[PDB]
Design a binder for this molecule. Sequence first.
Ligand SMILES: [Mg+2]
Ligand SMILES: [Mg+2]
Ligand SMILES: [Mg+2]
Ligand SMILES: [Mg+2]
Ligand SMILES: [Mg+2]
Ligand SMILES: [Mg+2]
Ligand SMILES: [Mg+2]
Ligand SMILES: [Mg+2]
Ligand SMILES: [Mg+2]
Ligand SMILES: [Mg+2]
Ligand SMILES: [Mg+2]
Ligand SMILES: [Mg+2]
Ligand SMILES: [Mg+2]
Ligand SMILES: [Mg+2]
Ligand SMILES: [Mg+2]
Ligand SMILES: [Mg+2]
Ligand SMILES: [Mg+2]
Ligand SMILES: [Mg+2]
Ligand SMILES: [Mg+2]
Ligand SMILES: [Mg+2]
Ligand SMILES: [Mg+2]
Ligand SMILES: [Mg+2]
Ligand SMILES: [Zn+2]
Lengths: 115, 157, 205, 42
Amino acid sequence: KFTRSRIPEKVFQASPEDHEKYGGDPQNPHKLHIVTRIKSTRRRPYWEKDIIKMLGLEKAHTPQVHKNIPSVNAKLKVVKHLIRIKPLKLPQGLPAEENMSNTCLKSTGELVVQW
Amino acid sequence: SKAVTRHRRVMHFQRQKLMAVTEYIPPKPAIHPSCLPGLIRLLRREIAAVFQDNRMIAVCQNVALSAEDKLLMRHQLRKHKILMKVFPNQVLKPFLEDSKYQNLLPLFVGHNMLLVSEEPKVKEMVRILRTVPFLPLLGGCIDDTILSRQGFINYSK
Amino acid sequence: KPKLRFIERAPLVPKVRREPKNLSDIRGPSTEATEFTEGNFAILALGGGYLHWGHFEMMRLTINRSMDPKNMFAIWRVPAPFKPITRKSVGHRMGGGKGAIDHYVTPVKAGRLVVEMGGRCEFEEVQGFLDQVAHKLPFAAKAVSRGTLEKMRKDQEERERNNQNPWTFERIATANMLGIRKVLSPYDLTHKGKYWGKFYMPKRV
Amino acid sequence: GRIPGRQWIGKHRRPRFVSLRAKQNMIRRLEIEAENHYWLSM
RNA sequence: CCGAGCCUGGUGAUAGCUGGUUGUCCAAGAUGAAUCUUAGUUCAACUUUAAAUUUGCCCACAGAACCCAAAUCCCCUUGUAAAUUUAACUGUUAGUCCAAAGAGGAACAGCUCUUUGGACACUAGGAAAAAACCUUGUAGAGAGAGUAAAAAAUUUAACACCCAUAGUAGGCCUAAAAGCAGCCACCAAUUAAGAAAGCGUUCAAGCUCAACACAAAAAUCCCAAACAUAUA
RNA sequence: UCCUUAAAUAGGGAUGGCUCCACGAGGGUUCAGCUG
RNA sequence: ACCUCGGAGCAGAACCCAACCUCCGAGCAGUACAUGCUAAGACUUCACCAGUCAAAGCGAACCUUUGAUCCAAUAACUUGACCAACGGAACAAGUUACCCUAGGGAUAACAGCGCAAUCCUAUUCUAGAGUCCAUAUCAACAAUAGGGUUUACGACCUCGAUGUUGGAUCAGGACAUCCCGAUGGUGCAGCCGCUAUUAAAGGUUCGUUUGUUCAACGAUUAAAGUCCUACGUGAUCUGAGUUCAGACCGGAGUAAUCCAGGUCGGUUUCUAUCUACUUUAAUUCCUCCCUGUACGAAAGGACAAGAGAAAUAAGG
Ligand SMILES: [Mg+2]
Ligand SMILES: [Mg+2]
Ligand SMILES: [Mg+2]
Ligand SMILES: [Mg+2]
Ligand SMILES: [Mg+2]
Ligand SMILES: [Mg+2]
Ligand SMILES: [Mg+2]
Ligand SMILES: [Mg+2]
Ligand SMILES: [Mg+2]
Ligand SMILES: [Mg+2]
Ligand SMILES: [Mg+2]
Ligand SMILES: [Mg+2]
Ligand SMILES: [Mg+2]
Ligand SMILES: [Mg+2]
Ligand SMILES: [Mg+2]
Ligand SMILES: [Mg+2]
Ligand SMILES: [Mg+2]
Ligand SMILES: [Mg+2]
Ligand SMILES: [Mg+2]
Ligand SMILES: [Mg+2]
Ligand SMILES: [Mg+2]
Ligand SMILES: [Mg+2]
Ligand SMILES: [Zn+2]
């Protein structure tokens, strides 16, 4: 039968080679994911459809910010084949109330407070 | 259709693509490496002993003879104390340098039949060879003294 | 008794209860009789299949005729036909229950040794008729010595270790990368993409 | 040269072949998802 | 126009059966039980509307059997915004193909059953045409832009070269079977050679192992045209 | 099995059991003739 | 044969899961006579009906499957008949081709389409036969391909005027070649065969029985090929078998009726709208010459080349 797939934990254990390749430090890990839906939920199980709806990724290619916490990561693991995940980078820290209206998410994944 | 079939079942195109993508890729071994840069010892010792046992040596090309003719020639040679030998050039070429015979290198090539002896009946051997107008005598070296065919003729006479 | 023992068509006491056609007994790698036992040569099954009594007779006759009884000895590494294939009548409309037993047959999985030779004789002396018998067999088969078996195995690990493809069927299936488990069988996680139905792809890492 | 029955469903189907383009597309998706694995590992 | 006339009436007979069922626009909306029952219906499930108030789904850890696998169930968080209940209610409710686990059949069927999931009965792009495969969905106008899936690949059989003295036809039984119908030993010389590995002899005789030595075929008519090398 | 034909899945013959006189747009077989 | 209920597998791990699916079992008994009464809270065979479990309490003591309602009977408590088609018409069978209506391609037969078990063909292996001799020839057990000609299977198109088989007419096509052509081998001296490669331009008979396709038989032929074409072709024909209403024989049945059987008889419509189409270098055989020459011990008997006769086909 076709069922939900249990991903073995070893899949989500980065190696030093991966760290060099992708440029993320396991210590001080990134706080927020930028997740975009790059694949249709059609012809996918209803549970993947539901996970996408929960994460708010109904529109493709529309970035959404999520917490990099284990539960959100569990959902993202369920639907990892439909999404692109990149860390949210904050070169100038999180925006202040003054410049909350002058931010822009660069394609590199950086939220710049100047635009 | 069942999961197991007598014929090879058609794969879902996604599975086919998966197989193609995960096909084995052999490594390239750098620049093409090809394009890149006790009978033997029995013969060794036997020939080592023979080189001292013999006092006069000669060589011929007794390959043009028949089995019966070769047997008769061997009988006529065994009438005397001379003994007929053959040994690979493959192992004799090392033997020449081993026994310090530099002038003997360009004498042994192809079929070579040694005629090791200590008493010259070469007069009668040449007489026997005469009635068979072939199988010419080849150069040899008696007691470390190289003799040409003219040398053998003079020594015989 | 340095000769290959005769195999009966059907068990003396048959199975009163008809059993289903569990093709899993042909699907996948063989876990039993995968290694040599008191022999040097054998016929390796490079695919799964069902060995009928006709195949048993072919093997027995050919090997017994073409081996030296005094030096070469043979041994079956496969049980006698024990699975009834309840082939129905020679024409009838579908239904009416399940059919009756007509032939008996023994399942064989890939990697299973079928017949094992032994005695004072080298591999090339036996390659000929073992290869003929292997071709006769209903599944892919190969005349394999102990040395050749170990050589091909070591070659398989060499492939698995040296392939430059970043993408392996194991990695993709286990991680469910492209949602391919929507297309794969649960058995594919363990067959690692080397088995498809009863066919085994040795060339495929 | 006809395929018996209806194409793409029966026991005997049109042979489908994987183009280099299809292979590249699948590999691209696989790379994206390998990156997803890495970013989900922390 | 007689297996039971014709006309009128009952009569607008009855029909679980066939056909038909007329303005515009928007929205929600899809696969069990019983039944003289499987061409139908009732209940359920689903569905629609309105209403009430309060948790609903996802969900890790912990937890769920002895006998003899994929997964599932359960729920703190978390992502989310839905769920339950109340009132009213029609209609759909004995489907198709694809992937997967099985059963039956013939490990046939565009075959028949059960289960998980997907798609179709809904838009569009692609796979030649194309319900069911792949990409993709929420709707309009545009003479803008980035993309998704998306193009089949392969061509394949030469071969070393030599020459082979003799114990003896090794014996046994075998008319003789000597290497060859068969057992048993399987030594041996020259420098170097298996009392037989294959042809051929009633038996001999004549030849080679070596070693000396150096894939495909079916019926109207093949089926885009073509192209090997201009930068990824 | 015999006759019929060169050839014969045709035709004819070796209360019950038989006897077909005549008849028939009945159903079969046939000689001869006749003929598009 | 089955129809209700239950246990096991399919259905491996909450529940749930079919079948003409694979197996098994039951229509109660034994026990006691608290095996009483009441009652929180729950389960539930996917609905309902029905069916389960149960603390506390009271009362004695110190249990382990079949069925509704109505209706009857009993003073009542309670009880019964079947309802086993086991959600149960209170009580009703055969038959229809004399049939009728409403429908159904959601459902049979011919046909089409899948499939290839069966069937057919080709290779691989030599077991083996072939006096020896695998491979001149044939061939077992099997293996691998291909075909879609049989027998079957499926129920996907067509049941809102298409019977079917044979025959006639006209044929289109495949080649897996029956003849004619060209070759290799041969267990081919010649003739002859056997085998294989290539070849689809052309050709491929007439009769008796039978409705016959086939078949047997007779006589021929260079040969009387295997197939596909809706088992080609009935808006071109025929209706002999089979198929409708009549009737017998035999058989089944109480009868009505029926029958894969035997027999006699039995309506075959269409004025063509559209497409399409309506004038596209022969073949064989025999005789003769070569020549009763080659070949062959003889018997027998050629090639290749040429001439003459016919015959057919086409065109006049
Ligand atoms: Mg088609
Ligand atoms: Mg009237
Ligand atoms: Mg009405
Ligand atoms: Mg809508
Ligand atoms: Mg009833
Ligand atoms: Mg009905
Ligand atoms: Mg007649
Ligand atoms: Mg009258
Ligand atoms: Mg319930
Ligand atoms: Mg009933
Ligand atoms: Mg009932
Ligand atoms: Mg159906
Ligand atoms: Mg019509
Ligand atoms: Mg041909
Ligand atoms: Mg047909
Ligand atoms: Mg008639
Ligand atoms: Mg009648
Ligand atoms: Mg009849
Ligand atoms: Mg009649
Ligand atoms: Mg009449
Ligand atoms: Mg007509
Ligand atoms: Mg007309
Ligand atoms: Zn080079």
